[PDB]
Amino acid sequence: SYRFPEGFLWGAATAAYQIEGSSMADGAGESIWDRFSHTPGNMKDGDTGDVACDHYNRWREDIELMKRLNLQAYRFSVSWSRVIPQGRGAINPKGLAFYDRLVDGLLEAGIEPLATLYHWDLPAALDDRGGWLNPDIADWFADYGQVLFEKFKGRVKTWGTINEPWVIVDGGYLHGALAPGHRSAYEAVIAGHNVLRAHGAAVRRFREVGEGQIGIVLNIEPKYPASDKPEDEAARRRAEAQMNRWFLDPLMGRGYPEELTDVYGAAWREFPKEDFELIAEPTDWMGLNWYTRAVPENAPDAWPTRSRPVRQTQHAHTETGWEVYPPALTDTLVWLSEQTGGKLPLMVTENGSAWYDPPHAIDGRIHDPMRVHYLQTHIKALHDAIGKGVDLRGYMAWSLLDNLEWSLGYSKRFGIVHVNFATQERTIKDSGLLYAEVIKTHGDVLNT
Amino acid sequence: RSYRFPEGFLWGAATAAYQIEGSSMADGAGESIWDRFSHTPGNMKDGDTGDVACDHYNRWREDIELMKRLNLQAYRFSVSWSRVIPQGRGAINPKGLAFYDRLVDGLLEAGIEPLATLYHWDLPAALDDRGGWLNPDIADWFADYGQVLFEKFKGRVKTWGTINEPWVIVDGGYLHGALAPGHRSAYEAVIAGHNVLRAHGAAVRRFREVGEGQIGIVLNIEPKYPASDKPEDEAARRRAEAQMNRWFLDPLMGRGYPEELTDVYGAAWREFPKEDFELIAEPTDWMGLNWYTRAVPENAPDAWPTRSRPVRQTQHAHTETGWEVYPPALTDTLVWLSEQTGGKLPLMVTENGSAWYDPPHAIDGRIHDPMRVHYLQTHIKALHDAIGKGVDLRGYMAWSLLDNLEWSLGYSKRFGIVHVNFATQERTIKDSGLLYAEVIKTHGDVLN
Amino acid sequence: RSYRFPEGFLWGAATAAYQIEGSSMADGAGESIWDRFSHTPGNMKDGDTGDVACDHYNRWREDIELMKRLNLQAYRFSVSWSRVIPQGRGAINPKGLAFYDRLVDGLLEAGIEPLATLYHWDLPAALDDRGGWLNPDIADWFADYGQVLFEKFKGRVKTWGTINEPWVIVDGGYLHGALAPGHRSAYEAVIAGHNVLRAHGAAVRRFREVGEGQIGIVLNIEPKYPASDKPEDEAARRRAEAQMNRWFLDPLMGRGYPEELTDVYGAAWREFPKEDFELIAEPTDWMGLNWYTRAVPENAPDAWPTRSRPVRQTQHAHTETGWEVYPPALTDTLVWLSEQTGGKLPLMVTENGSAWYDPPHAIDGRIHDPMRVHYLQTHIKALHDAIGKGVDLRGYMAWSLLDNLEWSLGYSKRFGIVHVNFATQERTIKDSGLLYAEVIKTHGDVLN
Amino acid sequence: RSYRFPEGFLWGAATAAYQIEGSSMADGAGESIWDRFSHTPGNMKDGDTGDVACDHYNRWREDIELMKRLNLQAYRFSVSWSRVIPQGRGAINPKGLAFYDRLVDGLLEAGIEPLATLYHWDLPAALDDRGGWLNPDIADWFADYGQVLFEKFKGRVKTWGTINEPWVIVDGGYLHGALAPGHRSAYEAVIAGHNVLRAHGAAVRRFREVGEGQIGIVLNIEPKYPASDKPEDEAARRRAEAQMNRWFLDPLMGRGYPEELTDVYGAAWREFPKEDFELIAEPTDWMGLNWYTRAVPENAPDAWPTRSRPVRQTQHAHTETGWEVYPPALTDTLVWLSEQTGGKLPLMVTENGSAWYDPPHAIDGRIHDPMRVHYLQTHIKALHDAIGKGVDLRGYMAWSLLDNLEWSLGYSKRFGIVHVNFATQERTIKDSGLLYAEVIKTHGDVLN
Ligand SMILES: OC[C@H]1O[C@@H](O)[C@H](O)[C@@H](O)[C@@H]1O
Ligand SMILES: OC[C@H]1O[C@@H](O)[C@H](O)[C@@H](O)[C@@H]1O
Ligand SMILES: OC[C@H]1O[C@@H](O)[C@H](O)[C@@H](O)[C@@H]1O
Ligand SMILES: OC[C@H]1O[C@@H](O)[C@H](O)[C@@H](O)[C@@H]1O
């Protein structure tokens, strides 16, 4: 039996820049990704989110698709620069009105709106003032949060602050593969600290003006042993500290992992005690974004963790090159439950897989059997976790739609609904068909 | 819509020695250029080699059993020159010859037509040390090698292929160097191309003297379509077309070399003795077509040596090898090739198929490959269209029978209609293979 | 022909703080962007940093003795912003200011005129974290920094430079990312350039309020010559000329931004408030020119963003930095710059010199410098030619006094007229600085 | 300090055919592998070829005058195989052979001893088409080629060299592919090296039959020094040493192949029949040493195939080809080579010199090359040190007489003691050449 607990919430997730398009429309401001994507060499095939899924225009169609999928929740992000073009100061009413209509549409459809404040699209105007390197951003972010907290009070009840601080910082400040495209360990350390402070400040503001539940969203990639060599275990700890514990540990009031002094070396810094008090402001829930695991070994020339993943050729890999290994999802959920004392409600806010699909539907269908297989095995892994006592309250499939996979462009399809980027025609994939049935049966269909 | 095929139409599947056999040093087998090439670092993806491959040398009995499950009427395979004659010239390796002796007898008795190819890219290293395809004497070495097989398998193998894809042998092996023997030279490419043709002609002459049955060459054609109405693009198209599709076909048809090659190869181009062209044009009994895709070339001044590059056709699906999926071009090519041969040369599609990601292991004893399924059914229909237009097409060989070593791309590119678990050597018939077996049994009727 | 120079013509040598000082953390000095950039792997050739450099912070007295041996009449240096004001704003570091206090006293006492530059590329990291040159507030930050020096050195430093080479600051640091802070964005480049201009103006205004002497900016100019008669190439030349040579000069002369920048920077280009340009065009008392070579631009469609690239001038010598040796272009540039200023602005060649290979140690107390010696003779002569056509040229600063850290190219590029053995810090006067010392003594007569 | 050399000690300068002659197709000359290699895009720096070079084929009389101006007692040159025998075997090219006929007569009449090298890397393309150095027959082709020269210049050329630098021929041409014929294969490298040795032996045997004078091989040696006291590094040093310095010397001394080569080349290594080693160790009359620098190899697991890499010796000067300047290593090498040959073989430094930047044209009728001057004097001194230690050194040939085509590095690397302006073909004696002319004249007394 794979029936899920009472009240278990099923949904799907997106992000603003990945689906919306209409980057300049109706007074929308300029974001770091507007700039980054229009700089040559940054994006695969020169792709941008200028059009994407055209969701800003086709959201009503997209809500209809959600209903066909029997979604009970829809997780989305708000574009900071669409609502507050200069990041601070004047509101863009028409921009804010889009989310206003969207949320009401969802509520009328009986779909719970789960909003994320920040999904990587920082206003360019704030980047010009230092972005995540400017400690004032904690205040700017809380103010932005307040606007949505009050505007949507009683409508959006479950809130996420930051989506994946690691990717934001590792990609955007440490290695430069993502906006704003900086490459510096000095900046990475500072950016990481201010992301945490910003989350904390947003939660404090939420206690003052908000209604419902608030939490952060972390991606975790569990690190498994490559050998019995002590050098590899040390490497595994470095990889694990830099990716999985960097943010979780201070969030739990335990300070930064000890290994970061070694990983970041001279770039490492100590911060005032009041910062850590702020960062550890108690939350109501936490989101887990999960896709795969890694098997790190020692890699002396790899900067800065001195580690590299060992290819697990015994298992399938997705088109993004990620190992398919559902037991590690169960392990990670158990681990995170322990890290939170089993007292913090958990929600898989993202999980899914990318495989090749044709650019157009065939016979009005898209057959994606590997995405189908990934979906069912990982949902089963959720059930195993719940059986081991993990307080897990929901699952959001990434993603609702094929979309802009950031720097990898449109070449990587994560959607359970196929998007023809030439015609904007939507087609529900076989994965989406199965998912709609998983929801209807509350897991029962996984028996067969 | 009826897709019933002509009476006597031959259905089979194809492989090549180095891609499936393994046992590279076993039982007195000689060293080939691919034994050397694959064991040189940086040449092969993931450092893959053909040392084990599908272990077909050991498991051929199992594979014949698979052919019977697929209802195959023919099996197209290549003979390893260096397995049969270790030094390329001189002493026979009896136990190596015995493998093909057993294989053919096994096939005949299964009621399967053995279609043998003399050369599928695995030149003996000992001959490479004597210049390989750059030594004009290779025409004679090849004829001698052919004679051994012609006489040994007389009355058993009745349909013979000489050279499989002279273009890939030369473009890859001598012009750009991505394939064995890994040379990069326009000067050598011109010469190697000429001797490949001469070697083919010499083998046909030898066949008339000592052979029994039908003999021909196997060409790959990639039809070149217009990118625009710009004259410089049409000139680009003609260059690309001449270098890839007409380079070998024209002198094989007694029309000398394409005029554009003087422009393409410049100072590397040469004139050859008239007696060479007499040899090259030695009349054949049939011709094989290897076909996968089309291209849409545009002018590209810095592209060496044709000054052309393909325009990505984003409107259509692409395989994992990056090839556009477009079956009408197959119909067009067959008509074109029929015209170029006056409609009097029997044609056979000796290779056609597609590469898509498959997991490294079967899942519940199945491999679901819907895009390979779709490719298969659409291109087989495209054959029927060609036959309806008067093309003398007498057979179809699916590439490939097994997932195998895709040369420099290693095992990462799966062409098989039968899945091979390269960890365990377990075979699993893919959904594409299941459909093909039904296409054969119904002689096309399953397509309607 | 006499190559004697007008009375009052000032002879000197030039350096920059980060390139020579070392002692990055010494005596409460702050962290700069070059402290970060240089310690990030892959940014610097051979992993060189400015941690030690010429150890000038410790050896400045010895170096002043060398200036005397060279018969220098002026010494041009830069003040390290973060050494004086560690956080860029607020609390002053007394000891950091004490060093420059002592240095200036030492110069005047030795009879050598101190020419201070406010900004030579080493922005405080604290200010970079607030947006750096992307934050419009930096004009105020810079002015306050300038005031601290203007007052401190009232009556001692009489000739002031504000910004050293805005183009290199922006093109290298924000457009292409080859220099600190290592950003790569046309959007940021436009904004940074504007704020660099604004900061210059605000500095000049503050100077009028609180300072005694003359003040000006220092531009680098690289004259663009025709590569052919082709229209495309002439358009390329304008784009190249506009982006490098006119971008800053034109608004400094109140002529606005060059029209071609709209074409070069496309969607990244922006229009600014008219009040900004009035601040930018604040009257200066002089202008400095950095000159080394010319360029011969041709059309290059894939070269971003000017769509131009230099044609190698094989008929002439090239320095180790790859710059063509062509002294006539210095004469032309000086005339051109005189035209652009209107003859009403005093000019001073504030950097000129060349890099050639020298051994890492002196050979028998000597460094034989024939090509650098030759460069100096031919280029000093070209000044006279300019003075001969009535350009108001009032001085010449040789780059550089010492072999130093050539930024990203590390210590591998030696510009010094004095050799520095980076292994021992031992100084050795090159033949180049030795012809130079003689040129001053004879005031240009030795050149006849 | 006394630096007078023994009576009879022979002073000269050296060139190679392809590097200086030009006139690649002139007067019935055949095509070589370097004609092909150099005209393939990507192979040569700046796309440089030897089509013109120093135009020596046309200007050899002017050059002979230069040798007299330099008071050369000897001129070491190579004969172009394909210029004399266009197809490598068969018909002789009269006018091609006539060129070397007149050249030798001009030298003798000028009192300059002609030192001919049979093979300086320019294999006939026609023989490369037969496998080149991978074909065991090449020993006979080379012997036949030698005989043509041995008889033509009987009594006129008395000192003969067979192979110039087997290591560079094989390491560059067959192992790494940086030189013609551009192959990259350890399997081919092992075989090529063996046939080069066999060809050397066969040529010496033929010389005994039909020639007059003294014959020997020319080896390059690059002495390997310890990088540390780590065992991993000493093993790397031994691997590097065996593959570069002992690979050819040891079998030439009847000592067989170094045992480390089974470790360096692994599965590519082969055993050869005992008869071959008799041929290889065919007694010679003298041996040449090409020497320029040393190396300090450390362990490099990823470096193929020796798994070693040189540690940059920053304490010393390096030439423009990146070679450390360290004269004591020259003395050590000569002592080593003397010991290896039992002291009973006469030796001659047959190449030594250095590359530094020179302008493309003379500055007024002079080229001041102080670092090349310094290299020359310090190394000629190191020769004297060697002779003082008992090494039977009989002469010294400066590499090179003229600035020429430095193979793949093009004309960018100047080794000449005489400057060549490749725009005008005008020659100008460098200061190094002026010093050399006096060193000869005082028989070393100037070094005093
Ligand atoms: O597809 C990879 C995904 O990684 C997730 O963790 C991010 O939240 C998504 O925006 C992204 O698309
Ligand atoms: O590239 C896919 C296939 O192309 C064919 O034409 C070759 O004969 C095969 O060996 C290869 O696997
Ligand atoms: O590139 C050589 C020199 O260029 C000058 O314009 C810069 O001001 C120096 O700091 C630099 O060393
Ligand atoms: O490796 C030694 C080689 O050095 C090069 O600089 C010369 O040009 C060659 O002729 C010589 O054989």
> Does A266 contact chain C (CB < 8 Å)?
yes
Q: Which two tokens stand for residue A439?
A: 């929801």
Which of 360-379 (C) contact D at CB < 8 A?
360-361, 363, 368, 370-371, 374
Cβ of residue A289 lying under 6 Å from some atom of ligand 1: yes
Cβ of residue D165 lying under 6 Å from some atom of ligand 4: yes
CATH number of C1-448: 3.20.20.80
Q: Which two tokens stand for residue C439?
A: 């040129």
Active site residues of B: 165, 351
Q: Which two tokens stand for residue A196?
A: 């945490």
User: Is the torsion defined by CA of D399, D402, D403, D409 positive or negative?
Assistant: negative
Q: Identify whether the C-beta of residue A379 lies closer than 8 Å to the C-beta of residue A447.
A: no
- Partners of A367 on chain B (C-beta within 8 Å) are 368, 370-371
For the CA of D165, the closest atom of ligand 4 is 12
Best mutation target among C185, C188, C195 (most A Cβ atoms within 10 Å) is: C185
> Rounded to whole angstroms, how far apart are CA atoms C129 and C126?
5
Helix axes B138-152, B186-210, angle to 10 degrees: 30
User: Would you call C36 and A187 a contact, using CB atoms and an 8 Å cutoff?
Assistant: yes
> Rounded to whole angstroms, how far apart are CA atoms D169 and D188?
12
Residues in chain D: 448
- What's phi and psi for C429, nearest 5 deg? -70, 120
Closest by CA to C308, choosing from C228, C249, C406, C189, is C228
- What's phi and psi for D142, nearest 5 deg? -70, -35
Cβ neighbours, 10 Å, residue D402: 23
- What are C382's strand-pairing partners? none
Cβ of residue D415 lying under 6 Å from some atom of ligand 4: yes
Instruction: Say if residue D420 is exposed, middle or buried (CB neighbours under 10 Å; 0-12, 13-18, 19+).
Output: buried
Closest C-alpha to ligand 2, atom 8: B164
> Rounded to whole angstroms, how far apart are CA atoms B308 and A138?
54
> Rounded to whole angstroms, how far apart are CA atoms A163 and A218?
7
For the CA of C121, the closest atom of ligand 3 is 10
Q: Which DSSP letter does residue D291 get?
A: -
Cβ of residue B16 lying under 6 Å from some atom of ligand 2: yes
Q: Identify whether the C-beta of residue D427 lies closer than 8 Å to the C-beta of residue D369.
A: no
The CA-CA-CA angle for residues C171, C174, C177, to 5°, reads: 85
- What are A31's strand-pairing partners? A123
The greatest distance separating any two alpha carbons of chain A, rounded to the nearest whole angstrom, comes to 61
For the CA of C168, the closest atom of ligand 3 is 6
Instruction: Among B399, B404, B411, say which to mutate for ligand 2: greatest number of ligand atoms within 8 Å of CB.
Output: B399
- Distance (Å) from CA A221 to ligand 1 centroid: 13
Residues sharing a CB contact under 8 Å with residue A443, sequence separation 6 or more, in sequence order: A2, A3, A4, A379, A383
Active site residues of A: 164, 350
Cβ neighbours, 10 Å, residue B106: 18
- What are A158's strand-pairing partners? A114, A213
Question: Between A and C, how many CB-CB pairs are < 8 A?
Answer: 63
3-state SS of chain A? Answer: CCCCCCCCEEEEECCHHHHCCCCCHHHCCCEHHHHHHCCCCCCHHHCCCCCCCCHHHHHHHHHHHHHHCCCCEEEEECCHHHHCCCCCCCCCHHHHHHHHHHHHHHHHCCCEEEEEEECCCCEHHHHCCCHHHCCCHHHHHHHHHHHHHHHCCCCCCEEEEEECHHHHHHHHHHCCCCCCCCCCHHHHHHHHHHHHHHHHHHHHHHHHHCCCEEEEEEECCCECCCCCCHHHHHHHHHHHHHHHHCCHHHHCCCCCCCCHHHHHHHHCCCCCHHHHHHHCCCCCCEEEECCCCECEEECCCCCCCCEEECCCCCCCECCCCCECCCHHHHHHHHHHHHHCCCCCCEEEEEECCCCCCCCCCECCECCCHHHHHHHHHHHHHHHHHHHCCCCEEEEEEECCECCCCHHHHHHCCCCCEEEECCCCEEEECHHHHHHHHHHHCCCHHHHC
Hey, is A127 helix, strand or coil?
helix
**Å from B259 to nearest chain A CA?**
36
Peptide bond into A79 cis (omega under 30): no
- Partners of B320 on chain A (C-beta within 8 Å) are 356
Q: Identify whether the C-beta of residue B250 lies closer than 8 Å to the C-beta of residue B340.
A: no
> Does C267 contact chain A (CB < 8 Å)?
yes
User: Is the torsion defined by CA of C40, C45, C48, C50 positive or negative?
Assistant: negative
User: Would you call D360 and C314 a contact, using CB atoms and an 8 Å cutoff?
Assistant: yes
Closest C-alpha to ligand 2, atom 12: B406
Closest by CA to B343, choosing from B300, B389, B303, B379, is B389
Cβ of residue A402 lying under 6 Å from some atom of ligand 1: no
C351 is catalytic: yes
> Rounded to whole angstroms, how far apart are CA atoms D116 and D149?
9
Cβ of residue D168 lying under 6 Å from some atom of ligand 4: yes
- What's phi and psi for C159, nearest 5 deg? -115, 120
E strand spans, A196-264: 213-219
User: Is the torsion defined by CA of B46, B51, B52, B55 positive or negative?
Assistant: positive
- Distance (Å) from CA B77 to ligand 2 centroid: 12
Q: Which two tokens stand for residue D199?
A: 């060809």
> Rounded to whole angstroms, how far apart are CA atoms C324 and D375?
27
User: Would you call D360 and C317 a contact, using CB atoms and an 8 Å cutoff?
Assistant: yes
User: Rounded to an integer, what is the distance from CA C153 to the centroid of its chain?
Assistant: 21
> Rounded to whole angstroms, how far apart are CA atoms A393 and A385?
11
- Partners of C183 on chain A (C-beta within 8 Å) are 180-182
Q: How many Å from the N-terminal Cα to the C-terminal Cα in chain D?
A: 5
**Helix (H) / strand (E) containing D341:** none
Q: Identify whether the C-beta of residue B337 lies closer than 8 Å to the C-beta of residue B289.
A: yes
> Does D191 contact chain B (CB < 8 Å)?
yes
> Does D322 contact chain C (CB < 8 Å)?
no
Q: Identify whether the C-beta of residue A161 lies closer than 8 Å to the C-beta of residue A287.
A: no
Hey, is D199 helix, strand or coil?
helix
- Partners of B314 on chain A (C-beta within 8 Å) are 359, 422
> Rounded to whole angstroms, how far apart are CA atoms C309 and C323?
14
Q: Which two tokens stand for residue C180?
A: 């600190």
In one letter, which amino acid is A97? A
In one letter, which amino acid is D221? I
Shortest-distance ligand to the CA of residue B320: 2
User: Would you call C36 and A127 a contact, using CB atoms and an 8 Å cutoff?
Assistant: no
> Does B158 contact chain D (CB < 8 Å)?
no
Cβ of residue A414 lying under 6 Å from some atom of ligand 1: yes
Hey, is A91 helix, strand or coil?
coil
> Does A422 contact chain C (CB < 8 Å)?
no
User: Would you call B183 and D182 a contact, using CB atoms and an 8 Å cutoff?
Assistant: yes
**Helix (H) / strand (E) containing A398:** strand A392-398
User: Rounded to an integer, what is the distance from CA D60 to the centroid of its chain?
Assistant: 20
> Rounded to whole angstroms, how far apart are CA atoms C176 and C178?
6
Q: Identify whether the C-beta of residue D50 lies closer than 8 Å to the C-beta of residue D117.
A: no
Residues sharing a CB contact under 8 Å with residue A159, sequence separation 6 or more, in sequence order: A114, A115, A116, A117, A149, A206, A210, A212, A213, A214, A215
Closest by CA to A215, choosing from A245, A251, A244, is A251
Q: Which DSSP letter does residue B349 get?
A: E
- Distance (Å) from CA C150 to ligand 2 centroid: 76
Closest C-alpha to ligand 2, atom 1: B406
Hey, is A368 helix, strand or coil?
coil
> Rounded to whole angstroms, how far apart are CA atoms B169 and B163?
9
Which of 288-317 (A) contact C at CB < 8 A?
303
Residues in chain B: 448
Hey, is C421 helix, strand or coil?
strand
> Rounded to whole angstroms, how far apart are CA atoms A270 and A272?
7
User: Would you call A316 and B423 a contact, using CB atoms and an 8 Å cutoff?
Assistant: no
Best mutation target among A36, A184, A306 (most C Cβ atoms within 10 Å) is: A184
> Does C128 contact chain A (CB < 8 Å)?
yes
Shortest-distance ligand to the CA of residue C121: 3
CA atoms within 13 A on the CB side of A190: 23
Please name the residue of chain D whose CA is at the shortest distance from the CA of residue B134.
D129
Cβ neighbours, 10 Å, residue A345: 16
**Resolution of the experimental model in angstroms, please?**
2.1
Closest by CA to C371, choosing from D361, D318, D426, D355, is D361
3-state SS of A179-210? Answer: CCCCCCHHHHHHHHHHHHHHHHHHHHHHHHHC
**Helix (H) / strand (E) containing B348:** strand B347-352
3-state helix, strand, coil split of chain A in percent (to 5) is 45, 15, 40
E strand spans, B169-223: 214-220
Among candidate residues D165, D241, D260, D282, the one labeled active-site is D165
DSSP string, D112-170: -EEEEEEESS--BHHHHTTTGGGSTTHHHHHHHHHHHHHHHTTTT--EEEEEE-HHHHH
Closest by CA to C409, choosing from C11, C7, C91, C19, is C19
3-state SS of C145-199? Answer: HHHHHHHHCCCCCCEEEEEECHHHHHHHHHHCCCCCCCCCCHHHHHHHHHHHHHH
- Residue of A316, A359, A373 lying closest to B317 (CB–CB): A359
User: Is the torsion defined by CA of C427, C428, C431, C433 positive or negative?
Assistant: positive
- What are A10's strand-pairing partners? A395
User: Would you call D184 and B182 a contact, using CB atoms and an 8 Å cutoff?
Assistant: yes
Cα Rg, chain B, nearest whole Å: 21
- Partners of D361 on chain C (C-beta within 8 Å) are 315
Q: Which DSSP letter does residue B31 get?
A: -
Hey, is A137 helix, strand or coil?
helix
- Distance (Å) from CA C71 to ligand 3 centroid: 23
3-state SS of B60-93? Answer: HHHHHHHHHHCCCCEEEEECCHHHHCCCCCCCCC
Closest C-alpha to ligand 3, atom 11: C406
**Helix (H) / strand (E) containing D58:** helix D56-69
Q: Identify whether the C-beta of residue C430 lies closer than 8 Å to the C-beta of residue C369.
A: yes
> Rounded to whole angstroms, how far apart are CA atoms D284 and D217?
8
> Rounded to whole angstroms, how far apart are CA atoms B199 and B214?
17
- Residue of B41, B129, B268 lying closest to D135 (CB–CB): B129
- Distance (Å) from CA D180 to ligand 4 centroid: 14
Please name the residue of chain A whose CA is at the shortest distance from the CA of residue C177.
A182
Best mutation target among C184, C190, C195, C269 (most A Cβ atoms within 10 Å) is: C184
